């Protein structure tokens, strides 16, 4: 499906379908289009830029693929900056964009491509939820309950986007997950990201524990030895 709407660049985020996020916008070149799209069926195209998070992005500075996202609110703030809450809807490819003065006009696509063998994908889904489950245990910044809340949800595409959204992926991976149309492939990629992380978090934990035991052993040695002094002193001062 061909769609002809405007593009808002995101400095360092990727907004996945069914992901809700506050964007903070303070440019003379954005808000005016964030309003003109507000009263135009409430739908925005969200494309992230790349290397040198340059405040004045050109036309080659955007990625090929983005997210169509609806606007949940707009809110002027004490410093003149609009907090705009959004929800991502579906991914779409750039045919060609256009810097029409300030904002960006663009065409035109839609995400819609699954895979064969739903037995493999059944397993692969189960493996993914189960890996995430063990992942939040090591992450712990993530609400232990949005795991189980969306443990139910059928949608594999949505499962993968929920996992992507809740992990501290680098941009490149963020976008490559957006760019992958095959839901199986992105589930296996994210399972590779989780595992990598998990390993890293196990290394760091072991290190932190060796380090704590050392601090505690050293501190106690110093205390015991300030004791020995203070006693030898009180003893000398006797006969």
UniProtKB/Swiss-Prot annotation:
It comes from the Bacteria. Disruption phenotype: When both lon and ycgE are disrupted levels of OmpF decrease, leading to lower drug susceptibility, with a greater effect at 26 degrees than at 37 degrees Celsius. The mechanism is not yet understood. Decreased persister cell formation upon antibiotic challenge due probably due to increased levels of MazF toxin. Signal peptide: none annotated. Induction: By accumulation of abnormal proteins, such as at high temperatures. Under stress conditions. Residues 5-198 form the Lon N-terminal domain. It is found in: Cytoplasm. Homohexamer. Organized in a ring with a central cavity. ATP binding and hydrolysis do not affect the oligomeric state of the enzyme. ATP-dependent serine protease that mediates the selective degradation of mutant and abnormal proteins as well as certain short-lived regulatory proteins, including some antitoxins. Required for cellular homeostasis and for survival from DNA damage and developmental changes induced by stress. Degrades polypeptides processively to yield small peptide fragments that are 5 to 10 amino acids long. Binds to DNA in a double-stranded, site-specific manner. Both its proteolytic and protein-activated ATPase activities are stimulated by DNA, especially single-stranded DNA. Both high- and low-affinity ATPase sites are present in the homooligomer. Optimal peptidase activity requires ATP binding and hydrolysis at both sites, but ATP hydrolysis is not stoichiometrically linked to peptide hydrolysis. This is Lon protease. It comes from Escherichia coli (strain K12). The gene is lon. The chain holds residues 7 to 245 of 784 of the full protein.
């Amino acid at each position: 499906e061909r769609i002809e709407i405007p593009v808002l660049p995101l400095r360092d985020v990727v907004v996945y379908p069914h992901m809700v996020i506050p964007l903070f916008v303070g440019r003379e070149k954005s808000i005016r289009c964030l309003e003109a799209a507000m009263d135009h069926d409430k739908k925005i195209m969200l494309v992230a830029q790349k290397e040198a998070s340059t405040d004045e992005p050109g036309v080659n500075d955007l990625f090929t693929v983005g997210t169509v996202a609806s606007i949940l609110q707009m809110l002027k703030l004490p410093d003149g900056t609009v907090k705009v809450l959004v929800e991502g809807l579906q991914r779409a490819r750039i045919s060609a964009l256009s810097d029409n003065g300030e904002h960006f006009s663009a065409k035109a696509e839609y995400l819609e491509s699954p895979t064969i063998d739903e037995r493999e994908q059944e397993v692969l889904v189960r493996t993914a939820i189960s890996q995430f489950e063990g992942y939040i245990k090591l992450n712990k910044k993530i609400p232990p309950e949005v795991l189980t809340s969306l443990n139910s949800i059928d949608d594999p595409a949505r499962l993968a986007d929920t996992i992507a959204a809740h992990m501290p992926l680098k941009l490149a991976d963020k976008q490559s997950v957006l760019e992958m149309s095959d839901v199986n492939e992105r589930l296996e990629y994210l399972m590779a990201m989780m595992e990598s992380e998990i390993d890293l978090l196990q290394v760091e934990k072991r290190i932190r524990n060796r380090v704590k035991k050392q601090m505690e052993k050293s501190q106690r040695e110093y205390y015991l030895n300030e004791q020995m002094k203070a006693i030898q002193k009180e003893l000398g001062e006797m006969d």
